[PDB]
Symmetry: C5
Subunit: 311 residues, 5 copies
């Protein structure tokens, strides 16, 4: 067992195909996903040619160890894939048709900029390193790239599973490597973030704003501080489900902006009380009256500015 | 070792049967469960037939490697099942009776719409891909589908373990695939949600409503805000034990609706105080008196509307 | 290698023995425990008998693959046990003495009714399936059932490790199955629950009762609500360390009952203030005075009733 | 391959040695640690003895399967160790020098009594079970017991890695067993507990004591209750990182004692207010004045008593 | 298969090189990281040399088992690396060129002193133990040390992957051990700590300082205590994501220092009220006025002192 030799001096083409069966565990924090799929491989090995007449059988079946099989590996995996050889069929000409079912944890970075309204392009990079006797090249057999209809990935929508037909051939450690890019396009199902995080966060903020219709400092201090604590809780909850990004996320921006609102409202509440004690409730009253409009207006404007910057 | 050949040109029938031994780890968030069961396979291989009289042995036992065994795989699994071959028995007519005990982590989506009063149909999909020499078809031997009496799945009730007799036969990557659907029907034991989540959540809400029998703004602000924080806690606790759904759940709806109640009660408490400071306690008094009835009534009506929509 | 044939037509007795080495990870939520023990198997295989004299050896040693060894499996395990064959000894009469050291994750349900003052009976079910040529039966060699003195199971006391001598024989998928029940009797070390959960929970409740010696509504609302939140925290902490039971637990009952106390105390606090505002502090004063005795009395009575029902 | 036979009727001495390479994951809750070390085994097998002059070679090499190797196992492990045979060298007299590198998860109970100022003695128990032909005995080759300089165990100090030279020889299931005790002495790096848990816990308690310099019941109720909630948080945080002990820990004692302080302070704060409302501020004033001294004094005395009992 | 013998009496040089493919899971608490890379080994084995003319091939391919391959191990790993042999090529002069792709969990301590503004040097220690026939020594083939462009480590910046050319040779259990140090230089992406932890922590502290512009003790007690609770939350959140260090961290210092600020502010708040009740608001007023400047000034100075000490 060693590579099939060239007729002329051409490189060996291994036709590939990935057919998704299962998609699960898209971990945001880890930027990983688990995949269970069929990996199909085809190449001509003339050494394996046979006469169906002389051997009875139209197609021969081989055990992995019996024949030369190309060393196909995934680039962006945690550990080497768990594979089970489903079948190895050889036609009389020596054309090998290899099928395996595999499972792997794929490392694919995510762009959290538009979270939870983001979409992603997951990658599965197939690779072959060239042997000494001959160069091995990868190719996509589009007939063998797909996914089953039941492929669901919890809390995401699957747009497309396609392969970039042209491999990336390059040198690595004094040998040629032929790499293919399989692309899984998905979009996050943002629905649940609305009643679980967005609306509750807004409600608590709006409740803080009731202090603009109160002259009671002690009640205001309670209203603003208490809701700020509930906001910290939401911030912590949100940040625990996301990885630490070197960029500002849409969600991150909003969450942060809201802190400034609580801070300014505390200042207002402090100012209003200070003036009242200092026997000038007229100034205080006009500040409070302005705030009642300013706060919602500035909040609504700021959000428009943000959504614009982010989308 | 290669498939047994057809007498005429009929497909090979593999008689299947799953007998559950253990059911555990139904993870709601992951939408997975662990299973430990017997997998029974039975097909005819004439090449294995023998004389009952001349052999003197009623049945013959083989080692997996000695004979051709169909490649049965599960569709909705995380990784390929962990199997141990228990026994392989061949009768004189060449009927093969294979038995293995396996363990696997099954991927089966759940409908959270009626949580925690929901019922589910877990699936275990058995599959076989046809070979070049012949088409392999799956069949259910109802005599070999079951579960042991002790099979308990913590916090769930096991209604039935049945198999859809008619396999789904279809082409996949230029070969035939025979797929069977094993169904585990279960219903959630909702009992514990009542004293742990439902009642405490109602209690805290009812406690907020005591502010309708108080003229103290500062005490009211404390009553409503404090309980709202306890509600956020329950919401977080509930949402951490559930996956992110693209649909509204019964629980989710209730939890959300309750936020509106806390918000409106804050408005009322603000309104009542505002009118008191503005020297008109008569208007305030009639608003508070109305609220005392409105709040429970609207709450009770809203819940009826919801339960109707959901059940 | 195939089963030893019967002298008459008797079944094959496999003498068993489990000797515990390690006991760890009793997971309450999962209702599992890990075990590391010796498994001893002994049966007669005449085909291996020898003359001690012409051999010049009292005992013969074998490698697993060399001889027929019964397929013993555990019923209530997550995955098939991890075993290492320690030693296989053959006496002149063909008596085989097999020893292996194994590790396994055992599924054994727990009765949470008396938690944290509960005791449990963990099970380890040994099984063997009968073959075509003969019926394989299990037996307990009491000389080979035990545990080492150092076997400790964190936060539990080990009472006894015994085996039910008479195996449960039954047909499962047209073959007789012989099952043995090994029983590990344990009792929970309740000590720590007293200073960590019980007493703190009582302290916070008693602190709520100080509102019966206060006329300040605003301070009372703070006392009762604040402690109720600390109670919710204890409830959450307790419920996270336990599985969801379809029955009421002793702890569960107490925890729940206490909610009613906080609810009623809120009502009292509301009533007392309402009467004070309504210019009738005499009625309020006698209600508060009654509560001061009622609350502790009813609490103490309720607990007596509960402990009775549960123990 | 079978044991080397005795010259006289002496037992087989297997000289052992453990050389630590890595120490990690000391889990307090689990009472486990992970270890990566060299395991060295040496014994005389005369059958292997050769001539140094004629053979030309002064040392002869073997593959595990080629020769008899004693079955050494660890007692206090979760699962059987992961080992890689490094080398097997045989000297002219038949002395075998076996070396393997292994990794294992060790089960070793901890004494939480002095936490976080505790020290521990971790154990690694080596064992050998005697065979039918001969008795196997373990011995410590002190030249082969050690640890590398870089062996660090996060948040612990490594004092010593020594072996108790005299093995524990005893009967187990009608055979002899020889057991060695390897001891890893460590002491907890308590530093971080001071600014993260100790001081914050004291600060919140001292803040509660400011109510002894306040006549405002409503402010006092807030001071004492709020800090008690922060104490419950610290208690929960501390108890989640420790296993459930049947004994009282130093930390446990302090944490609990502090609850009594919050309870008594609540009583004081209630008493002071009650007397004030009852128009006798002189009695109240002298109670508060006494408390100002009593509380710190009793706290300081109680801690001295505790530290004494525990250290 | 045994080591290539020395021409003179020189040690065997094994030329190494690690080429990183994947970098993930830098766990701060565990002080571990996962790595997926190519391991390249090259040594001369003259017993394998050949004439390119007679053989008619300029290279020779071998299966691992066919030839002698040095036992290279990693020092700082949890368990032995998961490796797949990619290729083994022999040149005419008997120069062996080995390549494997491996995955491992590396134990590399981190210096938390400057967190979250820290940089780290991760280590990968390659080792070889010399055999009886000869001494093995490791060397770096700089042409074969690298990383691919896509190598990203979430929340960290990869500065350099270099190897210390000169191995650390030493005696370990009477044999020579040659050790190489591969160094991965990284710097933490501190960005996210600013809007998620730093700023919110400052905001809550600044909000506490509004009590210096209030005469309301009850409102002040609420402001300072409530924010102190939010600070405890941040402290807990921060400490859960870090290991327990025997040294003070920059973050740790700040977090702790801030507690003193809350404590002193409580004292001030208590003093101011005490003076007011004692009918001397003039002294109280000047203390409060001083605090308004003192607090921010001392805070700003203290931070300057700290940043200096730490950077
Ligand atoms: C709290 C502050 C309010 C946050 C709401 C942000 C919604 C948003 O702005 O999200 C916008 C996204 C759509 O973005 P997209 O389809 O990926 O657009 C990508 C293509 N181009 C042209 C924009 C580049 O949401 C939705 O379709 C529904 C949002 C409902 C949210 C209701 C509340
Ligand atoms: C907080 C608001 C109250 C929530 C209570 C909802 C109960 C409910 O509405 O649940 C209804 C479920 C029964 O639903 P089902 O048997 O699956 O009906 C499916 C079939 N058809 C005709 C409805 C479609 O509960 C119970 O049997 C007991 C509920 C006790 C809850 C006590 C509180
Ligand atoms: C908060 C409310 C108080 C809860 C305390 C319940 C204690 C209890 O009632 O527990 C009772 C258990 C004993 O139960 P047993 O030995 O299993 O009895 C089983 C046999 N027969 C006859 C009862 C059936 O506790 C103890 O020995 C010590 C309990 C100390 C708790 C101190 C507080
Ligand atoms: C909150 C209440 C205060 C708790 C502080 C307890 C400190 C202690 O008491 O700890 C004592 C331990 C030393 O104990 P050891 O070296 O193991 O003594 C074992 C040997 N003989 C004779 C005692 C038996 O701490 C220290 O060296 C430094 C403790 C600094 C804590 C500063 C706060
Ligand atoms: C809350 C208190 C404020 C904490 C802010 C500390 C920032 C700091 O002091 O960090 C300093 C680090 C740079 O340190 P370095 O590049 O590793 O310097 C190592 C080399 N020599 C000469 C110092 C030794 O941050 C930054 O470049 C940006 C920090 C922005 C923080 C904004 C808030
Ligand atoms: F700010 C919101 F739009 O985004 C967040 F708050 C999140 F994550 F969705 F909860
Ligand atoms: F019924 C709703 F309130 O949902 C809650 F009860 C739940 F989910 F069960 F905890
Ligand atoms: F109810 C009592 F038994 O105590 C419980 F609440 C406990 F111990 F926390 F589980
Ligand atoms: F009480 C002291 F021993 O410290 C404890 F509170 C601790 F370390 F925080 F757990
Ligand atoms: F405050 C600085 F010390 O850094 C802190 F904010 C941190 F690490 F982010 F928690």
């Amino acid at each position: 067992v060693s590579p099939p030799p060239p007729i002329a001096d051409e490189p060996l083409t291994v036709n590939t195909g990935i057919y998704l069966i299962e998609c699960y565990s898209l971990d945001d924090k880890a930027e990983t996903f688990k995949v269970n799929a069929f990996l199909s491989l085809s190449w001509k090995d003339r050494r394996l040619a046979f006469d169906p007449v002389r051997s009875g059988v139209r197609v021969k079946t081989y055990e992995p160890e019996a024949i030369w099989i190309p060393e196909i590996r995934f680039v962006n995996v945690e550990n080497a894939r768990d594979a089970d050889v489903v079948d190895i069929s050889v036609s009389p000409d020596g054309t090998v048709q290899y099928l395996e079912r595999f499972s792997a944890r794929v490392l694919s970075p995510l762009d959290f900029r538009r979270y939870p309204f983001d979409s992603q392009t997951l990658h599965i990079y197939l690779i072959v390193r060239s042997v000494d006797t001959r160069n091995i090249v990868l190719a996509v057999d589009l007939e063998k790239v797909g996914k089953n209809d039941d492929v669901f990935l919890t809390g995401w929508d699957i747009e497309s599973f396609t392969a970039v037909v042209k491999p990336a051939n390059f040198a690595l450690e004094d040998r040629l490597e032929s790499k293919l890019d399989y692309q899984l396009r998905i979009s996050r199902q943002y629905f649940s973030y609305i009643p679980n995080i967005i609306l509750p966060m807004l409600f608590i903020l709006f409740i803080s704003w009731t202090a603009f219709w109160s002259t009671s400092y002690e009640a205001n201090v309670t209203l603003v501080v208490s809701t700020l604590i509930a906001h910290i809780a939401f911030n912590i909850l949100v940040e625990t489900n996301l990885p630490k990004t070197p960029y500002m996320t849409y969600t991150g921006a909003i969450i942060f902006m809201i802190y400034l609102f609580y801070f300014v409202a505390v200042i207002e509440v402090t100012v209003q009380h200070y003036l009242k004690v200092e026997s000038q409730p007229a100034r205080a009253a006009s500040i409070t009256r302005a705030s009642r409009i300013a706060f919602p207006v500035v909040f609504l404007l700021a959000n428009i500015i943000l959504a614009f910057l982010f989308f």
